[PDB]
Amino acid sequence: RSGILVFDVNETLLDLTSLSPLFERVFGDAKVLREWFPELILYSQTLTLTGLYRPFGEIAAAVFEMVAANHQAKVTPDDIAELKTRLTSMPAYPDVAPALTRLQDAGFRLVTLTNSAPSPAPSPLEKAGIASFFEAHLTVHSSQRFKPHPSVYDSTAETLGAKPEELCMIACHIWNTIGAQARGWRGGFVARPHNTPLTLAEVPQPDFIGRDMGELADQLIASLTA
Amino acid sequence: SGILVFDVNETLLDLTSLSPLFERVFGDAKVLREWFPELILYSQTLTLTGLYRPFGEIAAAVFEMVAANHQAKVTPDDIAELKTRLTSMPAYPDVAPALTRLQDAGFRLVTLTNSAPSPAPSPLEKAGIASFFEAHLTVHSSQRFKPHPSVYDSTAETLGAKPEELCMIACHIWNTIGAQARGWRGGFVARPHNTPLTLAEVPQPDFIGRDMGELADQLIASLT
Numbered sequence A: 001r002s003g004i005l006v007f008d009v010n011e012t013l014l015d016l017t018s019l020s021p022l023f024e025r026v027f028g029d030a031k032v033l034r035e036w037f038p039e040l041i042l043y044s045q046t047l048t049l050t051g052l053y054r055p056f057g058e059i060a061a062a063v064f065e066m067v068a069a070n071h072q073a074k075v076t077p078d079d080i081a082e083l084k085t086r087l088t089s090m091p092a093y094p095d096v097a098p099a100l101t102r103l104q105d106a107g108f109r110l111v112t113l114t115n116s117a118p119s120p121a122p123s124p125l126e127k128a129g130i131a132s133f134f135e136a137h138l139t140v141h142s143s144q145r146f147k148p149h150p151s152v153y154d155s156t157a158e159t160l161g162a163k164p165e166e167l168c169m170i171a172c173h174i175w176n177t178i179g180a181q182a183r184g185w186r187g188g189f190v191a192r193p194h195n196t197p198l199t200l201a202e203v204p205q206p207d208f209i210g211r212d213m214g215e216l217a218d219q220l221i222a223s224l225t226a
Numbered sequence B: 001s002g003i004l005v006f007d008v009n010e011t012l013l014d015l016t017s018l019s020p021l022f023e024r025v026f027g028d029a030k031v032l033r034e035w036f037p038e039l040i041l042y043s044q045t046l047t048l049t050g051l052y053r054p055f056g057e058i059a060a061a062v063f064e065m066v067a068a069n070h071q072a073k074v075t076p077d078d079i080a081e082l083k084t085r086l087t088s089m090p091a092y093p094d095v096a097p098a099l100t101r102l103q104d105a106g107f108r109l110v111t112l113t114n115s116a117p118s119p120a121p122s123p124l125e126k127a128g129i130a131s132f133f134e135a136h137l138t139v140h141s142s143q144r145f146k147p148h149p150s151v152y153d154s155t156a157e158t159l160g161a162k163p164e165e166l167c168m169i170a171c172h173i174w175n176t177i178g179a180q181a182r183g184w185r186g187g188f189v190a191r192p193h194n195t196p197l198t199l200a201e202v203p204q205p206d207f208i209g210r211d212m213g214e215l216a217d218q219l220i221a222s223l224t
Helices: A016-027 A030-049 A056-071 A077-087 A096-105 A150-160 A174-181 A213-222 B015-025 B032-048 B055-069 B076-086 B095-104 B149-158 B173-180 B212-221
Strands: A004-007 A109-114 A136-139 A167-171 A186-190 A208-210 B003-006 B108-113 B135-138 B166-170 B185-189 B207-209
Touching: A016 A030, A016 A056, A016 A077, A030 A056, A030 B032, A030 B173, A056 A077, A096 A109, A096 A213, A109 A150, A136 A150, A150 A167, A150 A174, A167 A174, A174 A186, A174 B032, A186 A213, A208 A213, B015 B032, B015 B076, B032 B055, B055 B076, B095 B108, B095 B212, B108 B149, B135 B149, B149 B166, B149 B173, B166 B173, B173 B185, B185 B212, B207 B212
Parallel strands: A004 A109, A004 A167, A109 A136, A167 A186, A186 A208, B003 B108, B003 B166, B108 B135, B166 B185, B185 B207
Antiparallel strands: none
């Protein structure tokens, strides 16, 4: 077959800016979303480095509290339930289903891989109406370590019975494409708002770079026989 | 008594000193608090994936990335001004009185930083607090950033100490988690924009302090 596309879910497929109104209300500033998210990602990596694990959603809440304390902003048990509700209910970007349709047409197998723990029905991909584009939905939960620990990717390849060379990781997170590339995967970057390639010496660049999912799908579609 | 290991950047040298740079390039004084987490994130990313670049170099790339993100302009020597204040952060006023007390109470003092060894005068030297510490350790030799377990264990060996004789002192909850995971103690100093993280099973800091003075109070008493 044409090879296997492994999509990150939060922010890559599902719209993180949908959480803006929560930061708008609590902090008076929607842009704090851009502080809370790196802090979330920082702590997940910290737990992973130190042999510790909690579900992504619990880390997310706790980090929300912590960013709250830092900014001198009040938080209630209710602000927490709204974070869970929103985080688990982000809608698909408009460019997604079109692009996944086209990739399905080109003979690509499509798979999701997320930091989120398995939820009960319906999943965030189900509520967003795009779950059935994928043959599998994999999570870091089975690894008990967050991306980009090598074992997440390696156990993903194992489970899919694919070789590194067959796999391409798709994210708007440079840290995620880096992690996958370090294992010999290909890496597809999609430039969702507030993500731009890190240019740094010795650090491999994304193999494929699109300003959106449609553009990224073209380049993957194109290089089937380039 | 014991060895106190001190994180350097933000814990000891004043990080808020970069504010003029951020208002200048971006237009906001708090974008500091987006860049820094991004910086710590990518350093943990490089460590986790077997890659390494000097901390200062990651800081540069991460600044430009935060620039392209906020769609804001940056020059060849906008980048250069960053390098400056980074290696020239002056110490918080509470540093000196707090440390002098600690030496007298019997405590041995070292530093451990993510920053690579610099040309003299080192940021600790220029800040004039270098002569307080018996050793300056860097992760540069490990090619791994905190909180990789090997940074702490390799500090332990190099200092010939056991975990229980060591306390890590940072304003960074991840750094104290990292050190506590290795059986060290962790001393939290609540520098502006840093707060503990209650999350079940994740070790809370052993000693809490709003400034270095209050933390020192906590530590010195903890002998009797």
